[PDB]
Symmetry: C2
């Protein structure tokens, strides 16, 4: 096997996030002239999940920032009314299957992520921890060294890694669940496709 190891991101990769009252958030954006469907809402909301200064609770200005939308006095008010700070995590359908599949086909797996206490809880909750040979910023290269290389990084926007001597030790796969990167090809839209690309790659 060319690739010993797969590194995987957390949000928009294994686990999604949405506001609890997503249909209300959807309706507020639309009322202010941004008709986006719910995939676009969920994409941005999981990114906003990462900018919260640590009890999860996204800030509505961060969510607009990720969306490229200007923080109207009013929009922000209506989003607060919509209870945007209350979110939920959900597991993608294909996640357990993907992880089990890679593991049982001889790959070592590392998780690459930020907010450890929240992420730990959710790893516990969805019973994802058992799959990982390493949990990983600079804990990155320790994780990489542990699981071995060359490795493949599956991510929703972790993009290109830069550990290595002559050559990058990590080749990326862009996983785009929400059709946000139509101008990137070689992208995959779910972890079935991601597994097939991995298999093609070696």
């Amino acid at each position: 096997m060319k690739y010993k190891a797969v590194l995987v991101d957390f949000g928009n990769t294994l686990v999604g996030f949405k506001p609890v009252f997503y249909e209300k958030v959807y309706q507020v954006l639309k009322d202010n002239g941004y008709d986006l469907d719910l995939r676009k809402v969920f994409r941005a909301y999981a990114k906003a999940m990462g900018m919260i200064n640590y009890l999860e609770h996204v800030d509505p200005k961060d969510f607009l920032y990720i969306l490229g939308i200007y923080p109207s006095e009013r929009l922000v008010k209506e989003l607060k009314e919509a209870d945007i700070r209350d979110g939920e995590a959900f597991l993608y359908d294909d996640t357990l299957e993907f992880l089990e599949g890679l593991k049982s086909n001889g790959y070592k797996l590392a998780l690459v992520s930020n907010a450890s206490p929240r992420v730990k809880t959710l790893l516990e909750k969805f019973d994802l921890k058992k799959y990982f040979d390493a949990l990983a910023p600079k804990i990155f290269g320790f994780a990489l060294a542990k699981v071995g290389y060359p490795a493949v990084h599956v991510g929703d926007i972790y993009e290109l890694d830069y550990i290595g001597a002559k050559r990058s030790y990590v080749d990326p796969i862009l996983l785009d669940r929400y059709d946000f990167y139509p101008d990137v090809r070689d992208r995959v839209k779910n972890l079935r496709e991601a597994l097939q690309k991995i298999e093609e790659m070696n």
Copy 2:
């Protein structure tokens, strides 16, 4: 014009960094069984530039981390002896020409980088500042974007994929790989000449 604007990284894109005594750093790595060429040294050294808690002064453990090399007692000692903490900036040959060409062909330009005292000094030093409509020296990066307009193209040594946007990403990337570090990404460019031609293809 599809693309209104170009965002460009700093290190390994516009400006390189190397240890002042690069040939001695080369020799120390080689002595310890890592025979890399100087391209590889300079690539890692510019990356180690972002990790210093600051007077620029790279840490040799960060430099080894980037290289993917385990920090021996001895390797680290020999690198300190080699004065690895002393570095220098240099401008790529094609940088002025590239920036001027984009500007005078109607692109708005943003610079995307960190450590702003260092970077400002160097922008002044190489006379780069006059080309930029915005400096995103965090959230600042999205403010730069709004200012220069979109869709925009991000040329980088690997900032890679940006994620501002509503229906769709507002920024398409180009990987600029000056030091032949990403042979498994094609569509990559090795020059700002190639970078410019790819920009022109993309619209």
